[PDB]
Structure formats: structure tokens, C-alpha cells
């Protein structure tokens, strides 16, 4: 299917960087802006960030698994393009 939550790189992917800057926003919900944050690939979890975005007033409390996966897909997508 599709999540409708776009997550993309914020800074040029340089490789061998344990932390990456990401940008998240929504285009299909099936503050209405773009959220920029850092993500540690070896330590932090997409579910952890998603909760924080919950406890920060971006999406609903039970909309956590959906945003967690949309971040997890981008983290996957950046490590597969990292071979």
C-alpha cells in the first residue's frame, strides 16, 4: 500500500555518518508543515521518534505505528542506497 507520510533526507547523504537529518511531512492523511529532525541509525528507533512526534503535537497517539514505518522506510531506503 502507501503511507502518505513523506520522509526524505535533509542534508546530503555523506555515508559513514551515524546520524542523519530527515524531513517529514504529510500529503494524504488517509501544523500542516515540514518537520526536520536528526536520526541515529544504530541507536534510535523509528517508533521512538514517532512517539516523540506524538508527544509533541503532530499526529494522534494511535497514529504512531504509521509514522514510525514512514520513517523506517526512509531509514531502510537510505541504507539500501548505502548498499
Amino acid at each position: 500500500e502507501d503511507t502518505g507520510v513523506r520522509v526524505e533526507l535533509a542534508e546530503e547523504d555523506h555515508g559513514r555518518k551515524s546520524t542523519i537529518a530527515l524531513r517529514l511531512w504529510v500529503e494524504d492523511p488517509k501544523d500542516n508543515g515540514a518537520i526536520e529532525f536528526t536520526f541515529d541509525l544504530e541507536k534510535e528507533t523509528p517508533d521512538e521518534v514517532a512517539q516523540e512526534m506524538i508527544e509533541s503535537g503532530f499526529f494522534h497517539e494511535s497514529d504512531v505505528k504509521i509514522v514510525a514505518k514512514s520513517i523506517r522506510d526512509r531509514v531502510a531506503l537510505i541504507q539500501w542506497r548505502r548498499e
Binding site: 524531513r23 511531512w25 501544523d31 508543515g33 515540514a34 518537520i35 526536520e36 529532525f37 536528526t38 521518534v49 516523540e52 512526534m53 508527544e55 509533541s56 503535537g57
Partner: peptide
């Protein structure tokens, strides 16, 4: 453009794009 701090420390930057 605003910065949003979660009570645990993570800083978000909110932008229009």
C-alpha cells in the same frame, strides 16, 4: 519557521516546504 522541543530533548524544526 519555529523550533519545537520535546520534553525528552529531541529538537524539531518546523518549516513550510
Amino acid at each position: 519557521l519555529t523550533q519545537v522541543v520535546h520534553s525528552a530533548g529531541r529538537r524539531f524544526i518546523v518549516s513550510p516546504v
